RNA sequence: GGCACCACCAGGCGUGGAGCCUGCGGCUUAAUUUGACUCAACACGGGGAAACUUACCAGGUCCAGACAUAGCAAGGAU
């Protein structure tokens, strides 16, 4: 009911559009003063990585959440094709999912929004 | 046996001779793009081409290769 239940409001947010996939967009979409939530995923090797992210969110404030197995990071955010109902997806490995603008249809985004309070 | 000035007769104006224009052949050319050769090809393709036309020649670009499949890929395909 909340954290994984939560990736069908970043679904939503991926229909009307808004998921700024991946670190050279993820600064962007931060810095544009546009970056809502940052879901991240700690299975990335480079230190760095997660270094700068939490770096350029510290300096704005707009929101962490930490999810494992990017390769589900991936399949959330789109990176994938739907292929059958049982999905085969050929998922692309995904790190920084910045929901700019945010999909509006609302529901779970509220409580993640709670979460996102705390 | 007929018919017809795209035949002749009686003629008129001509062309064929000259200069030039233009089309065709040939030659030359990097290419001198090419179709058409008695009437029924040859100022014909409505073709009087500076560029475009343009089909030819010497070069340079671009993809305007849908769609399906398989890969590469948000640590980036492009
Ligand atoms: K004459
Ligand atoms: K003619
Ligand atoms: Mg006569
Ligand atoms: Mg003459
Ligand atoms: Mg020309
Ligand atoms: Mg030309």
């Known amino acids: 009911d909340l954290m994984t239940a939560l990736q069908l409001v970043m ?4 229909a009307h559009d808004g998921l700024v ?38 300096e704005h404030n707009v929101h962490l959440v930490t999810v494992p197995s990017a390769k589900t990071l991936g399949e959330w955010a789109g990176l994938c094709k739907i292929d059958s109902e049982g999905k085969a997806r050929k998922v692309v490995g995904c ?10 249809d609302s529901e779970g985004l509220h409580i993640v929004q709670e979460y996102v309070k705390s």
């Open 21 to 58: 996939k991946g670190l050279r967009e993820a600064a962007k979409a931060i810095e544009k003063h546009a970056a809502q939530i940052c879901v991240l995923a700690e299975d990335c090797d480079q230190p760095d990585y997660v270094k700068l992210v939490k770096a350029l969110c510290a």
């Open 95 to 104: 790190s920084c999912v910045v929901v700019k603008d945010y999909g509006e």
């Open 11 to 14: 679904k939503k947010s991926s």
